[PDB]
Amino acid sequence: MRECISIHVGQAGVQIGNACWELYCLEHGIQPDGQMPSDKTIGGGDDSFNTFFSETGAGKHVPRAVFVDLEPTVIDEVRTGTYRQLFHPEQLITGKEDAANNYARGHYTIGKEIIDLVLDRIRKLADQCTGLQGFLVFHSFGGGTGSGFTSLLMERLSVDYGKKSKLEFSIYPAPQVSTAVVEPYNSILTTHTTLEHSDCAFMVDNEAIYDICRRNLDIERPTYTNLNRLISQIVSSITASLRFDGALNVDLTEFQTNLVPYPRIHFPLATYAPVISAEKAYHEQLSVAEITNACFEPANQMVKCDPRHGKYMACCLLYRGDVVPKDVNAAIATIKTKRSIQFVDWCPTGFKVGINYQPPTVVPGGDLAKVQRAVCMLSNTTAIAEAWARLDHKFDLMYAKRAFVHWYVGEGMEEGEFSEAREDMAALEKDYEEVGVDSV
């Protein structure tokens, strides 16, 4: 009951999926062969972690997940990697030819060859659920598969599962971490196409994560492994309420009520703390007040933007570990007298708090320090439109010359789809302006 199925699309989605499922296993005490010695109900159960793991009669705990990519070499590393035994071979789906950084090939030319198979595997997972809650979809904006195949998959999921909820973790492109020149095109195309099909989308700016790794973990040039371990901690914070329970636990769906005031305004800003090296964590205990304070520092955002220059329509604090509400309330009282926290005039100004007691874990031999308490803030701020403005500007620069547009037309697309997608982004930006304006 309340199962969530995760779908990992393209290289970014798959590699982040590797990191996330490894972290889940460590948090839950599941070994790489899928055995979970603490779990006394063999082959089934209704425990909180069963929202994310099914069980075989042989004691294996299997991610409710599908990994899909149009080339094989990233999923092959899952097939041969440390956690190969976690997954049934049928959950890992690959084609032979990727989308060549081209939305059109991911959505149409190549993607249409494998979409029916992907949907048949997802159906196989859904059929094992007694009360499917929805989907979590992991993908980049910029790749041909992450943009184009994900939009196709989302459109098909709406047809096959109705209004069943679909949440995204979307990797927003940054020049620092490698990136095709056409990624602004792919980003706008997939954002426009998926907008009506997604209920809530957590954007993750690769530049934000890159900066956090360089600045807080003192890593000179972070790798994908560095970025994805940090990303998995944010994902884990956000899904922890689904996977654990406790008296102070608040379900992600309750936060979602507060975070989405209009269907299209569904892009929360995530901030996480604390991110600290082993050397600095040793002999330093970060208190509740300390980590809370860190959420309001822009350097700790998942997306680069300035909330001081927008307005809030919601603020949610997801705590894990050694945290009691008394310390939370005090920390928030302090924050509210020292920070620029301006809400829109049509929404209440309370912070919604949840506490998950299970403490955070880290991957042994990684760079993140193990801490006793952490927090992820989810806010809905009009400032997140700065991220769309930045992407729309790069789009416009190229599109006014039609640079690279022939690679999409060659695959059957029309310029009409470009201007329609760009107009939808313009209306999105205007939506964010309108909701921040004071009421008459």
Binding site: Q176, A180, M398, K401, A403
Partner: protein, 418 residues
């Protein structure tokens, strides 16, 4: 398992083709007998891009050797690695082309082409998933230029959805074989503009000047020129051959308008990361006789090879863009991409290879066009070509196309964001 099919046509095409195979065979740990004796599993992880696996654990270049004369091809079979090629993949005529594009394109080349396409098909059908083709050839001759562009077109009819990539050696009077080279080059450029996705311009005038000026070689041989070609070709294929790249991703990110697909390659050294970056962007290190300070960059790809700080590569690549921002078109954001491969080329601790789409490439086409127009204004040497069935309007067509190319590079050089 994204296979490339390699085709070498003519004298120049076969000689640089053969050096290319010697060079990357050494890099992957393959000996002339086709057996692997390397020391790093990174040499074999993508070996299948360029090699077929055979019986006895042998690796065979997925290569096709084509000429209208047996000469050069017999040299290839005799030279080092001569017996690594699949013997059925040699396809040679007897008559030759006579440095006549019309002979390679319409007459002699045309009745050898079908037997070349039979070998292409055999190589393609055993491919798990073909990326496309790469052709080495010169544009000044007759076989590589005339029959090479014929092969390109005929292959495009059977594989319309595969990438066509060429390494095309441009003629220079400083190395000049014949006098009709500007005809053969212009006729060839005409076809390349229409039927290839990406073309590395390997300019014999750049290679000569590099050998003479920088390397201090008073009498540069073809051996000295080709040494530059092989190092360049190894450099621009690095990301295809080791475990970020494939031919289609390369074309998607380098070619904003389908006709503007002629790349200026660069190599350093000809030693610190700043020094290496500086030299890679210097006009002296361009394999095309064009000054990038006389145009603007549409797109750039750089591969650094060897063990070095990637943070220092990132800082220096950002450095050269910020300090020269006027030379990078503003309407393609983030148009310089950088890759790093740990494995250096043979004989260097580190190296840098540069692939630029610069509007300064027009200086190359303008040089050929003036050598063309000087002969065509007086109808010089036309009988060689009308004598095979051609008419002057085809010369008039080929040169207008190449001048349009120049105008188009100029139009985007002059275009602004606001």
């Amino acid at each position: 398992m994204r296979e490339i099919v390699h085709i070498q046509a003519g004298q120049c095409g076969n000689q640089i083709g053969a050096k290319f195979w010697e060079v990357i065979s050494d890099e992957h740990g393959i000996d002339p007998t086709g057996s692997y004796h390397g020391d790093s599993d990174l040499q074999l992880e993508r070996i299948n891009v360029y090699y077929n696996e055979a019986t006895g654990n042998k690796y065979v270049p997925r290569a096709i050797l084509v000429d209208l004369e047996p000469g050069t091809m017999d040299s290839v079979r005799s030279g080092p690695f001569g017996q690594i090629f699949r013997p059925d993949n040699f396809v040679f005529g007897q008559s030759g082309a006579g440095n006549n594009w019309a002979k390679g394109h319409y007459t002699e080349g045309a009745e050898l082409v079908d037997s070349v396409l039979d070998v292409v098909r055999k190589e393609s059908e055993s491919c798990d998933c073909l990326q496309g083709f790469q052709l080495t050839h010169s544009l000044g001759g007759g076989t590589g230029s005339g029959m090479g562009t014929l092969l390109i077109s005929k292959i495009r009819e059977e594989y319309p959805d595969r990438i066509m990539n060429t390494f095309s050696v441009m003629p220079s009077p400083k190395v000049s074989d014949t006098v009709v080279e500007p005809y053969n080059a212009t006729l060839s450029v005409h076809q390349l503009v229409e039927n290839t996705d990406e073309t590395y311009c390997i300019d014999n005038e750049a290679l000569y000047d590099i050998c003479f000026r920088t390397l201090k070689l008073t009498t540069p041989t073809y051996g000295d020129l080709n040494h530059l070609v092989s190092a360049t070709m190894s450099g621009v294929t690095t990301c295809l051959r080791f475990p970020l790249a494939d031919l289609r991703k390369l074309a998607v990110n380098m070619v904003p308008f389908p006709r503007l697909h002629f790349f200026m390659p660069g190599f350093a050294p000809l030693l610190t990361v700043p020094e290496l970056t500086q030299q890679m962007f210097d006009s002296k290190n361009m394999m095309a006789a064009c000054d990038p300070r006389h145009g603007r960059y549409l797109t750039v790809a750089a591969i650094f090879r060897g063990r070095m700080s990637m943070k220092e590569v990132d800082e220096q690549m950002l450095n050269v863009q910020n300090k020269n921002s006027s030379y990078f078109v503003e309407w393609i954001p983030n148009n310089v991409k950088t890759a790093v491969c740990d494995i250096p080329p043979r004989g260097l601790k580190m190296s840098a290879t540069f692939i630029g789409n610069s509007t300064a490439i027009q200086e190359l086409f303008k040089r050929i066009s003036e050598q063309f127009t000087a002969m065509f204004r007086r109808k010089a040497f036309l009988h060689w070509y009308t004598g095979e069935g051609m008419d002057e309007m085809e010369f008039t067509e080929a040169e207008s196309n190449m001048n349009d190319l120049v105008s188009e590079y100029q139009q985007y050089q002059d275009a602004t964001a606001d």
